[PDB]
Structures are given as structure tokens and as C-alpha cells.
UniProtKB/Swiss-Prot annotation, chain C:
Domain Ig-like C2-type: 14-76
Induction statement: Up-regulated by coagulation factor Xa (F10) in atrial tissues. Up-regulated in atrial tissues by rapid pacing resembling atrial fibrillation.
Full-length numbering of the shown residues: 28 to 112 of 532
Organism: Homo sapiens (Human)
Coiled coil spans: none
Family as reported in the entry's similarity comment: Belongs to the immunoglobulin superfamily. ICAM family.
Subunit structure: Homodimer. Interacts with MUC1 and promotes cell aggregation in epithelial cells. Interacts with ARHGEF26/SGEF. Interacts (on T cell side) with CD81, CD247 and CD9 at immunological synapses between antigen-presenting cells and T cells.
Disulfide bonds listed in the record: C21-C65, C25-C69
Name of the molecule in the record: Intercellular adhesion molecule 1
Mutagenesis or variant effect for K29M: Probable risk factor for cerebral malaria at homozygosity
């Protein structure tokens, strides 16, 4: 449980708990039994929901992926036939902000794929029921060039085949970090620019984004082209379970403008100015 | 007989005494130690520079005016050219180090002011351009001894040339979190009526067991003026903040020729 | 969030001003007009729409009309002038 | 079981149980063995269905929610794309009347969502199968402005995604009251109007409705716009389980006219007048 | 570890802390207590307002100039309009009360001055007329919160109208005894180089066991400036004396309707 409250009464003595010194680095330490008179309150209220296994115990949304299915003629129509997404948690602003409380984390990740469809045109016939491939490409396996090449057959890549209309597909991805924890924030580069290089790496990106390769989620429609153009939307989800975290940080106040910790100029003012200091 | 305000710290052949100190903060309750054998990442023979680099190094003294807005140092790279720790660093591929940051600023009993001395794990800052993201050069991100300053205005340069640097905004603390929440880090506050020195003890904090010091900057030292300096006869006086840092329990791996980074 | 339909009101000294202040919500937990001017009520059916009947307008006043919708406290004023010979 | 009936016979004595006095507050206490002659009836009939766990053991209906799905052009068409409902049990008159027997109650709530669809027009093409979001918004989380804003991604709000055609989604909501029981009737305000206020809170609502914020159930259609306008109807259900109740009250006789205990003028006459007092 | 100069006093829901205090005087060596059953004068059921009136009440802050000559408060009647002790008082015929008088006055280390803080049992003062004797009105003898001031001149008004008040003469202490002999009372001296608060603990002192608080004023609080305030740059400065008084161990008898005394 949380702490109860002891039956204390008034004091007059040299033991003074109301006075601390925050120059020393420690926070305040006075519980309300110190400075006033308190009754006895047996406290049965627990902190069970605030723990990290339940603070991250929701299947959040991280991205929205779009694939289509039609008779492709041009080249831009052949790139609507599939979609390759680099796996990251930074393409939204709500699961990211819950994870940038902490510097380092360690969690087995559980994903679930909620998928919708629509007809594009109105009078171009109909279509049969559809099966969707979702293939996890680790860094190094060949990313697909077209929607029906040698790469989609997936002799070793983990693939799931969702028949449209079923329950959404779910799977658990373990801790796949090469460190001993996922560095949410990485304060360093990927390489060291040496003295008198003819390489001139004066465009090495700062910080986090030069170390994270988690994979590529490539999604096709396994059907051939129907007479009716079927436009699909796929919402990749994440739910961190078996969660551990280290080294807490303040949460994000101003909005994001990228994959880094950057912040845009027109939203550097998160507060709203009060009337005066004496406004209840 | 003894008091909390008098403290002598000795490491190697260096000594800091202080007679008006507050208590010392061991960061996250752990004293720094060597890499244990049950957690070792490399398999080469580790170099332990026992007393040649576990000693106090005194940086340059910045001047804290009434309009001074903040300072920042990246901690395993502000010591990049300091004695033998700057020679243990670039002759090795791996390096872990604990730290004893001691920040020195003193005035009379008629001055006033506050200095939030922080120590931020993975102090990732924002770039000063809106053309690209996560976009800082190497020289502008790693000044070394002199450190950098904060600023009370965000002016993103439209040039991608002069925008490859830290947009060191004080109230957003660089990384866009509010500065009033920065007390969740290991911190002490130099208050010019109570104390005159801030001592932190910083263990090696990283996800890896041991990592490249030349690439990766572990800690971020931050000094924010919370309440500005105000001396009533001379309103534009300057009292110096001198930062004295010691490596602790260092350990290095992967010996080779010297690494000399670029300077431009 | 909070709408005051007679925003621009001209009316001489001493007379009555009809002020219509409602909210953009369905449950006005706490809604009222802040002025030291006499007002009874005006009859208006509907749990949302609302009219106060102000009277004895002497000087220039700017009454604030709060409304405790479940998204914070809201703010709307109205502007009224007087007339003299 | 219920009470049996003892074999008693006639009496002639000063012990008179047939005469009570209801001025004292107690009800009648004579069982039928007192005033007549009774046989022995072993009573095996129990009161098992009349208990509160089975008296509230039905999934009642509390509201009917409507969402649609089409190519919205105007602004009123964009507010048909979603529906936000304030959670309460007072939007019908049958689960409310079963709960206004009791002043205070304590129950874990179990909801189930039974959802229908239709085509609006006739010859505007077809549509794919649909997935419905139902997001529980606690008081404080941002209610959605449009149907596809930042709020629907639900990084911490509990959401369910019902694929249309499946079994209806079900979930259990615990006792979420901030009191030690849900006050069905609250005889008081939310604040105290002080002496000589310039605030002039002479429009503070009476009674119950100024303390209950249970949340907001916001429902969208997760698909984009189909060529055919799909009009949906959603029937939110409640079933109180693990039920406890306190302080009983008489049941509602005349009809309701709002969320309070109010009553409309044209239905203040619940009885039907009999012919005379002597009508069997 | 502990010192005599730091003292926290808590009664009810009120707290006084002080960091430059002298020691506290328990008056005549007795801590106040409830009326014991072997000494009880009335036989009705006593009301014990346990925490609703045994708490610190802060009076008005008088300003101690360089020409300020003294102050006086009658103690069970300076609290006549203070919270519930002013409502326990006038709804009851009998009342006894212990007290914790805490007098608050502080300056810099460059000021100087002395404040004799007294507590006088049965502080009977002299009238300001020579027409009649023992001749003071009710309003002029019981000001309540604001108290009264002393004076360094005895001017008896020939009017019997304006002479119905206390002839508050400072060196004769009101009652015609010399002020240098007033140290036989329970006293502390606020000295602006040594301390900044005077704490007394006053038991119920009366010949009776319990008495009417509306009629009878038990104690007399007296603050005399022994050495006048003298600040060398600004010779006419003002430092405030704030008096904070708590009832202790109160007990009341004889409940009835409210007593509202005259105001003129």
C-alpha cells in the first residue's frame, strides 16, 4: 500500500523537520505528520496502476501504412502496390513521449495490425476477399523493389498472412537491441571525423538516428489485380511488455519537428501567461 | 566535532578542500567502480591508468555576469585534452569512467544568486536549423575545454552552414523539456548565501558496458542561473565559476595509434 | 466555448441591457456573468441557452461570462457604451 | 430457503400478536401462524433470483449511438464521421429506475457493444468490411475535434477495435468512483456561493449532475471514405456485476424529463381512478 | 546537535518556528493544566474546545519607532474576537485558560534596542482623571485586538468624560510602581543583538478556580522599550512588533445565548 498516517499531536522542541536545505541536492522530506497535527488514517490505497508494466500496458499507435491493389500501368502505380516502413516508435507523438521519460529501456515488444479496406472507384466491378503479407526485414535482407519479386517469398524472414475479415494478427518481438538496453537518447555520432580527411564527412547526422536500425516492415497485397481498385490502410501497433527502464528524464513539453529532440520555432511557448501572480 | 560544511576530496595527486560546502550527491546512489568480469564486453587486456588520470582537472573559469544565461559541458569530452586522460582516451577504442564534478563559485555575504548544477545522462541537444533534423557538426557539438553557453532566444539560422550547432535555449534546456523539471537529474544548487561549491559523484552510466569515448558523450554538465547575480553597489560585477572535474575508476581497451579528430 | 451574442451594445445611461451568454457544451456545470450590476433572470427554455436581464447601466462595463465546460474554464466578454447630453 | 409454516392450532390467551402499533416505526410482524390455524408446510422455495447480483444481472441498454462513413464536404458532414457520448446510465428509463431503488451502490461494470450497419443510398457503389474504434476518454484527455486528429491514436486511452461481423466486443470496467460508492442521488451543489461575490453564480445546477464525470466514449469508423455512405448504429450496454447497494428508496412513479429527479407537468397523474372504493 | 536558539511550537493547527530565539519562560514554574476535580467550582458539564481554540492567534503588528514608549494588552480580552475562542468566551459564563505568548520583533545586525516583554497578573491600571478614583469605562479598559500604548507624560484631563481611561504612564508602569522593578514578573527581554522572539508560557492565575472572562482580565501583556531603537543611516525607521498568542487548556461553563458587550 501507500503509507498510512500516524496519530501525532503538537510539538515544541529542537527537532525541526520543517526546515531542509535543497542546496544539498535532496528533495523535501517532510511528511504531513511533521508540521501539523494528524489523525490515524489506515491507508489501503495502492500504487498498482502507476507501475511501468501498467504505465506502458496499452497497445499504442506508431504509424499508418497504406497499400493498394489495382492494375498498375505506370511506375508510380507500381509503388502503390506495396509499402516498406522503417520500424521506429517516433512516427507518432504519444508513445514517444511516454518513452522519453526514460533514458534507457528494456522491453519485449508486442505488435498487432488493425487493417481496413475500401473501394476506390464506384463502377469498376468487384473483388474477392484479400490476404495481406507483412514481412519483417532485418537489416541486411533485401528490401523489395517490386511487389512480386524474389524478396517476398520469405524463406527466412518472419512473415504473417492476414486474411481480411479475421481477428487482427498479433505477434511478440523480443528484446532485439545490440546494447543491454534501448538507448532512447544517444549523445554521440556513428564515427569519428579524423584530422585532414579527404573524406569530408561534414554532413554526419547528430545523435540518435545514426545508430538505430531495427528493420523494415514491408507489406504487400498477396492477390493479383482485381477489377476494382482496393485501397487499404494498416495501423501498426506496439505494446511494450516486460518493461524495465533506467535514468529518468523530464517529459517533452514543446512539440516535435523530427526524429530527434529538435523543436520548431513557432511552438517554443508552451505556457499560457496568467493574469498576475495572485490568480487562484 | 565534524560538520557537513568542511570537505576534502583527494584523488591521485590532486586535492580539493572547501569550507562552505553543501553535502555531496552520489548520482543515483551508486559509487563508480571498475567493470566486473560478469559484464565485460571486450576480451582484450584492459589498461587501468591508476593514478595518472584519476585526478582533478581544472577547466577554464567562465564569468557569471548578471546577464549570463547558462553553460554546458559534455563530460567525457571536456577532458579530451587534459593530461594523460586525454592520452588514455585517443589511444583506446573503449573507455568507461566515473566522475567527480566539483563546481566552484564564491562571493561575499552581500551578493545573491543561484546556480543549478546538473548532470544529465545522454544530454542530447537540438540543432540550430530548421532545414534538417538531428543535424549538428562534430566541432560544434564537442568544444572540449571551453564548453558552450545557453541563450534566451531561439534564432534558427536559415543557412545549413551556420545551423550545424546546438540551439542552446535555456528554458527548454536544449532538448525541449522545461528547465523547472530538470531536478529529476542528479543536481545541486549553489546558493550564494548557503554554499560555495557543488560536488557530484557520477558513475559510468551507459546502456553498453564500455563504449567509445571519442564518439559517445555520456554525461552533460549543465549550470543554469536560476536567480541572477545581483550586487547592489556594482550591478555589473563578475564572479567566476570554475569547474574542476576528476575521472574515476577509468578503464580502456583496444590499443592502437593515436586518434586525432578534425578541428573544422 | 462561450458565446455572447450582444457583443456590441449601445444604450443610454440608466436603461436596461439584454445580455445573452451561453456555452458550446451540453452540461454547463458552472456558468455565470461577472458584473456588479442588478439582474434577476430572463426566461429561456433550454439547458444551454441563457439570458440575464441587466439594468441600471451607468458607466462603461465589461462583464466576463465564464462557463465550466469539462475542457477548462472559458472566457467571453461584451462591450457596452453609454450616452449623455 | 424461505420460512416454513409450523403446525399451530387455536389460542385463547393474553399473548396477542395480531395487535401492533405502527406509530413506533416498526412494520407489521404477524406471520400467518399467529392469527389463524395453520398446518405444517415444509418450504423448499428459495429467494435466489431476487438477490441484487441477479436483480441487476442483465445487460441493459443505456444509449444508442450513430456514426456514418462517407466523403464529407461540409462541416456538418464532418461531425457525422464520429460521435462522442458522455458516459451515464440516465439516457434510458429502465436501468435508471432499477438503480434509483438505492441511494448508494458499488459495482464493477461490464459493457458490450452491439453494432449494426446499412447502406444510405442505393446506387453509389459498395464498401469493404469495416473496423470500429471505441475509445474511453477519461476526464482530462482531449476529446476529438475531427474524426482523424491526434486524439484517436490512443497511446494511453483504452480503445477497442471491433471488426464488423464478429461477436460484439465486451469489456469490464471496475469501480471507478472517487467516493466509496456511486451516489445515485446527491443532495448538494459543487461549490458554495459566497457573500457579496462579483462572480454571481446564480446559475449553478442543483444536485446530482454537478459531480459526475465518468468519461467520454468517442467512436469513429477507422476506414476512410467508401464510395457508398454507410450509416451505423451502436447500442452501448451496461451490466452491473459484483453489486452492492445501500439505503433503499421508493421507485420512480411518474416519468422523467431530464437527468435529475424532475417531473413533467402533463404526467403527474400515475394512477387510474377506480369506480368506487368497493371495486374488486 | 540541538541548540537553545531554534524552537518550534505547535498547538492545534498553528506553528511558530524561530531560528534566533532565547529560552522560554514557564511562568512561576507551572505548565497550564485543566481544572482538577478536587478544586472545581461549578457543577455543570465543562466544554473543552480541544483544538478549535488552543491555537496561535496573530494580533495586529504595532510599529516600534524611536519615540515609541510602550504597549499593553489585557490577555483574556485581546483574544475576544479571535476565531472560536471568541465564540467559546461569550457563550459561557466561566472560563479558564493557559497562554503561550510569543512576541515577534526582528531587525538587522546593525540595529539596536531592547524590549522588556512582561506578563503581569492582575494588571490593574490607573485612571486618567483626578475627579474620581478607580474610574475607567469598559470600552477604554478593554480595547481588544489593537491594545493600547503607554505615554511619557501624565496629563489628567479635568473632564470626567475623557478621563475614563488608563493613565498609561511608562515609568510608573500604569499602576504607580517603578518600571525597573517589573522584573519580578515573568519576563523576557528582546535584545536585537541576541534574540528576535520572546516566548512565555502563562498558566491560569486567579484566586478563583474559574472566573468570567468577560468581566475579569487575568494577565497583562506589557512591552516596554528599555533602550530605544537606533538605526544609524535612517534614524526614523520602523520595525514591527507582532504579538502571537495561543490559548492553552481552555475550559468553559454555563452555556447560554451570546454575550455582546457595549461598544461605546
Amino acid at each position: 500500500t501507500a503509507q498510512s498516517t500516524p496519530l501525532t499531536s503538537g510539538v515544541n522542541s529542537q527537532e525541526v523537520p520543517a526546515l531542509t536545505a535543497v542546496e544539498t541536492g535532496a528533495s523535501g522530506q517532510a511528511v504531513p505528520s511533521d508540521v501539523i497535527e494528524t489523525r490515524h488514517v489506515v491507508n489501503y490505497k495502492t500504487r498498482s496502476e502507476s507501475t511501468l508494466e501498467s504505465f506502458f500496458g496499452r497497445s499504442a499507435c506508431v504509424t499508418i501504412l497504406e497499400v493498394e491493389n489495382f492494375n498498375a500501368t505506370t511506375d508510380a502505380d507500381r509503388k502503390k502496390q506495396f509499402t516498406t516502413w522503417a520500424i521506429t516508435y517516433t512516427d507518432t507523438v504519444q508513445l514517444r513521449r511516454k518513452l522519453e521519460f526514460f533514458t534507457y529501456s528494456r522491453f519485449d515488444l508486442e505488435m498487432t495490425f488493425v487493417i481496413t479496406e475500401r473501394y476506390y472507384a464506384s463502377n469498376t466491378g468487384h473483388a474477392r476477399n484479400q490476404v495481406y503479407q507483412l514481412m519483417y526485414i532485418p537489416p541486411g535482407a533485401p528490401r523489395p523493389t517490386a511487389w512480386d519479386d524474389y524478396t517476398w517469398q520469405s524463406s527466412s524472414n518472419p512473415s504473417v498472412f492476414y486474411t481480411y475479415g479475421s481477428a487482427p494478427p498479433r505477434m511478440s518481438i523480443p528484446y532485439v537491441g545490440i546494447a543491454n538496453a534501448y538507448s532512447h537518447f544517444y549523445d554521440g555520432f556513428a564515427r569519428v571525423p579524423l584530422k585532414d580527411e579527404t573524406v569530408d564527412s561534414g554532413d554526419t547526422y547528430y545523435g540518435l538516428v545514426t545508430i538505430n536500425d531495427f528493420g523494415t516492415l514491408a507489406v504487400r497485397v498477396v492477390n493479383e489485380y482485381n477489377p476494382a481498385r482496393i485501397t487499404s490502410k494498416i495501423r501498426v501497433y506496439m505494446k511494450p511488455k516486460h518493461v524495465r527502464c533506467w535514468c529518468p528524464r523530464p517529459p517533452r513539453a514543446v512539440p516535435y519537428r523530427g526524429e530527434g529532440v529538435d523543436f520548431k520555432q513557432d511552438s517554443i511557448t508552451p505556457l499560457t501567461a496568467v493574469e498576475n501572480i495572485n490568480t487562484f | 566535532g565534524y560538520s557537513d560544511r568542511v570537505r576534502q576530496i583527494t584523488l591521485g595527486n590532486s586535492t580539493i578542500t572547501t569550507q562552505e560546502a553543501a553535502n555531496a550527491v552520489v548520482a543515483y546512489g551508486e559509487w563508480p567502480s571498475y567493470l566486473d568480469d560478469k559484464e565485460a564486453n571486450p576480451i582484450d587486456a584492459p589498461t587501468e591508468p591508476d593514478v595518472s588520470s584519476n585526478r582533478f582537472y581544472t577547466l577554464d573559469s567562465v564569468q557569471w555576469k548578471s546577464t549570463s544565461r547558462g553553460w554546458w559541458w559534455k563530460l567525457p569530452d571536456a577532458l579530451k585534452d587534459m593530461g594523460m586522460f586525454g592520452q588514455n582516451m585517443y589511444y583506446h577504442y573503449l573507455g568507461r569512467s566515473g566522475y567527480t564534478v566539483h563546481v566552484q563559485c564564491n562571493a561575499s555575504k552581500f551578493h545573491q544568486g543561484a546556480l543549478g548544477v546538473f548532470a544529465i545522462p545522454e544530454y542530447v541537444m537540438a540543432c540550430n536549423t530548421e532545414a534538417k533534423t538531428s543535424y549538428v557538426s562534430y566541432v560544434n557539438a564537442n568544444p572540449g575545454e571551453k564548453g558552450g553557453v545557453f541563450d534566451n532566444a531561439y534564432n534558427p539560422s536559415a543557412e545549413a552552414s551556420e545551423g550545424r550547432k546546438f540551439a542552446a535555449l535555456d528554458y527548454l534546456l536544449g532538448c525541449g523539456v522545461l528547465a523547472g523539471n530538470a531536478f529529476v537529474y542528479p543536481h545541486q544548487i549553489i546558493n550564494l548565501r548557503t554554499n560555495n561549491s557543488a560536488t557530484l559523484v557520477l558513475p559510468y552510466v551507459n546502456s553498453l558496458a564500455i563504449d567509445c569515448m571519442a564518439k559517445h558523450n555520456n554525461w552533460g554538465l549543465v549550470i543554469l542561473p536560476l536567480c541572477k547575480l545581483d550586487y547592489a553597489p556594482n550591478s555589473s560585477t563578475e564572479i567566476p565559476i570554475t569547474v574542476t572535474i576528476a575521472p574515476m575508476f577509468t578503464e580502456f581497451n583496444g590499443l592502437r595509434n593515436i586518434t586525432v579528430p578534425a578541428t573544422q | 466555448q462561450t458565446s455572447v451574442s450582444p457583443s456590441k451594445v449601445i444604450l443610454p445611461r440608466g436603461g436596461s441591457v439584454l445580455v445573452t451568454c451561453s456555452t458550446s457544451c451540453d452540461q454547463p456545470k458552472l456558468l455565470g456573468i461577472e458584473t456588479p450590476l442588478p439582474k434577476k433572470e430572463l426566461l429561456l427554455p433550454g439547458n444551454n441557452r441563457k439570458v440575464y436581464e441587466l439594468s441600471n447601466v451607468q458607466e462603461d462595463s465589461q462583464p466576463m461570462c465564464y462557463s465550466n465546460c469539462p475542457d477548462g474554464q472559458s472566457t467571453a466578454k461584451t462591450f457596452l457604451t453609454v450616452y449623455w447630453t
